[PDB]
Symmetry: C3
Subunit: 310 residues, 3 copies
Amino acid sequence: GSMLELPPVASLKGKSITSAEQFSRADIYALIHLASAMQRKIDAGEVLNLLQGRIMTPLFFEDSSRTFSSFCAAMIRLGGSVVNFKVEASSINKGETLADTIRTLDSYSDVLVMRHPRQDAIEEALSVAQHPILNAGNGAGEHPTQALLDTLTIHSELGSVDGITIALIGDLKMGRTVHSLLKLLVRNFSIKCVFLVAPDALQMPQDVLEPLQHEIATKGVIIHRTHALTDEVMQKSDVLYTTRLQKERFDITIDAARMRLAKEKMIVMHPLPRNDELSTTVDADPRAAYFRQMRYGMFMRMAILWSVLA
Amino acid sequence: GSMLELPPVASLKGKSITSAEQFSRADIYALIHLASAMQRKIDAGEVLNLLQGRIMTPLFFEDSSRTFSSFCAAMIRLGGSVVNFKVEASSINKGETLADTIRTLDSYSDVLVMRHPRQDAIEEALSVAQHPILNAGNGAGEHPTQALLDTLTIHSELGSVDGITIALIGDLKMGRTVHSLLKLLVRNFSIKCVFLVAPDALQMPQDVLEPLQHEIATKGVIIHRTHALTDEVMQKSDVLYTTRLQKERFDITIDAARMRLAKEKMIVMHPLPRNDELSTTVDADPRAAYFRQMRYGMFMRMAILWSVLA
Amino acid sequence: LPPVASLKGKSITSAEQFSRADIYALIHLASAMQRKIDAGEVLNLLQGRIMTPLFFEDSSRTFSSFCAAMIRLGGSVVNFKVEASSINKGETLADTIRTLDSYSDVLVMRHPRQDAIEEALSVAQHPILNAGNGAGEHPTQALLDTLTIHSELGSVDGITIALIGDLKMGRTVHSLLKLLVRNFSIKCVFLVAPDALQMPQDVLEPLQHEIATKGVIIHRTHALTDEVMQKSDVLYTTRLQKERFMASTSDDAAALQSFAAKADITIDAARMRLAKEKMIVMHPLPRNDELSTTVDADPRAAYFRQMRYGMFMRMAILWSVLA
Ligand SMILES: O=C(O)C[C@H](NC(=O)CP(=O)(O)O)C(=O)O
Ligand SMILES: O=C(O)C[C@H](NC(=O)CP(=O)(O)O)C(=O)O
Ligand SMILES: O=C(O)C[C@H](NC(=O)CP(=O)(O)O)C(=O)O
């Protein structure tokens, strides 16, 4: 992969990432191609030195395994460095405010990666930070880089995004992942059909669906609400994207039996982590893409960091 | 051409840093000049490779945001590395002593950065370590690199340290920052006047004032106590250095209204974190330098690290 | 700095997986790495490679020396912390392994459960290095301990070694006894512990063939007798593993008390007056009161230098695994 170019995505340069609404179809494709080239070079064992002497600081005010780790790994694999700031042993225990904490890490860093239980926390950070801030999850609001890596996953597994039927399953109300993903998909691609599969209490919120109505209508995107993985859903979906019940903010299980109803050419996705909604019996199935999904996330996050800091 | 552009301060080579007392006026000017050269290169986007293959290990037995992070960032910006040792998950929980803990990190590292709630813990660490130890705060004692970066901030903001009138405000008793700062300023500069602004119970300790007796007399420094931030203090001070009540170790509030009495040209400083003593209404004021102070912190710690390890 | 080829791309689980030739090639590579680092040389061997530590229980030396080792090879570290991870959202151990496996070149794993490493092995593609699995094994400890003996005394064959303290729960002495006996011609091993904390059968029995055919003497005592002090070339002593005895049961109370009450195993300056001239005192660390600070000034106290040999052995290991 040594002869592949790594052109940064210019429209991302020096900008904070807060929403899936920020990106055009052309940004996304260009991030996909960049991530793909990142993957090729890293897998061939090539050493990248694009971000030498640039610092990423993670500001994680809630738990994370994948998002924290992929961002760190992505930064390192670009030749960058990470300052390992941790909230629990910080000067917040001395009474420091969220705003002063952002200002503090912003003094040392080239980019901040921020996750916070309050939906409004990243606007607050944005209002005081000089350097780009990447939204790693703002309460039940959004998770725009998950959306990007999820789309990368779809494109690499199935070969296209236009024309798919996708089921978003589980806690759609509190799932910031499915908020960002639906936005990113409906705004930039010709989705055929979206199954919104959730108990009534946990349906996709109105504040996500409504701003999309113009695009849903002009592109003819079919939106179908269910409360179960019916036979129809199992048989038409090219992607089953399922989610964890977001317990910390307070049928639909996929197992191998349920999987014998699925199409030959489809993928099962989950942003992770999972509880019982997604059975380990599915893990050996080639259509299980939720592990590969995590590796795609590192390479997308490399495409993003390089584009922001180039 | 490092030895022209970033000459290390030779006097610091291979030595621990424990007190503001160990530095001459010439050391401080050499560090300031090296620090602002660090700043010039980093701000222009130049990558430093001075300390590749060298390791800094933080040993923080109390909370920190600024001191930990700026040391980690400074190390990284010099091309060096950090081993992220955390006290809370260490073999101290198996009953290891402080001395054994120090020998352990001393075995792997080139330099240790230590913050500890006990005043004598730095001297206990020195009696066993082979490599330099940088005192990042020892109980209510001293914070010597804070005094260095505070002095860089004064010099860079105002142009001069000789001849200033400075107010040290808040919890002067337990304020390890004002202990070191007063030492550093009075031993090496001809300060016109110091205001110590605190009720008697939180006044500057006698063990700080007494040993400065010779310098106070020889340079004719004026020193007054007040119990409040009076109009006279407001109108005469070039530097308002304010501090947090160190609650964990047991009117003077600056706000926009009080700032209406300040000189047109002066700075408000605070080593941070702040509580109610320094109102956010001050933040927009050009004289508010307590955010820029954090960034000088990084560059001073670059100058220090490079000098210790060159 | 030639990598030891047998280690390439392989997980490290047990002291049993190494040959004599493996051990000497690691020793020589470790000592070659020490030469260069001490001379101030910078190594770029693993630039762009990532090590992720997965520690589910406490560590100072193993965690820090793996990180430092990785760094001094030019490699990098992703500082994954269990306490603030998605484990709190209910993620299983398996799914945790697969997660960090997606980003890393090698995982260094310590877990209070003996079978956890094997479970990690069954899901991960990249090599896993056992940094301690319960009271089970600590394979890189045994390797660095052997480097220490070799560097300090000059030779491993022919030694008399006392293994002292909590031998029941001591994963270090488990790995070390296997490594030594499988691959060296040991003259004598003193198993010095109270009965309640003696070396387990599941360690000794698989070694019995080698013990017998090599004619290795095994002597059990519950004290540091004159005989042990005068004969031993190495006194390898251990901490009582209190955390393996947190049940509040009578079985646990008896085991915990026996360390001091049913044995006489403290090493202090007075005791060291009985030791030979050419020998070393070792301890994987951390220590409590079983190894007195009055021994620290003795040239025969090797337990601090042992930590430094540890960093160099771990460099030789990481480089050999990842080359
Ligand atoms: O938490 C979830 O279930 C989904 C989603 N998960 C992630 O981003 C992965 P992690 O929490 O491991 O970073 C999130 O919004 O945090
Ligand atoms: O804590 C204070 O208020 C003053 C001073 N503050 C600092 O050093 C900044 P930090 O605690 O963020 O490193 C200290 O002595 O800790
Ligand atoms: O814990 C002991 O007493 C011996 C042994 N110690 C070590 O490995 C050193 P550590 O805990 O510092 O990494 C262990 O098995 O953890």
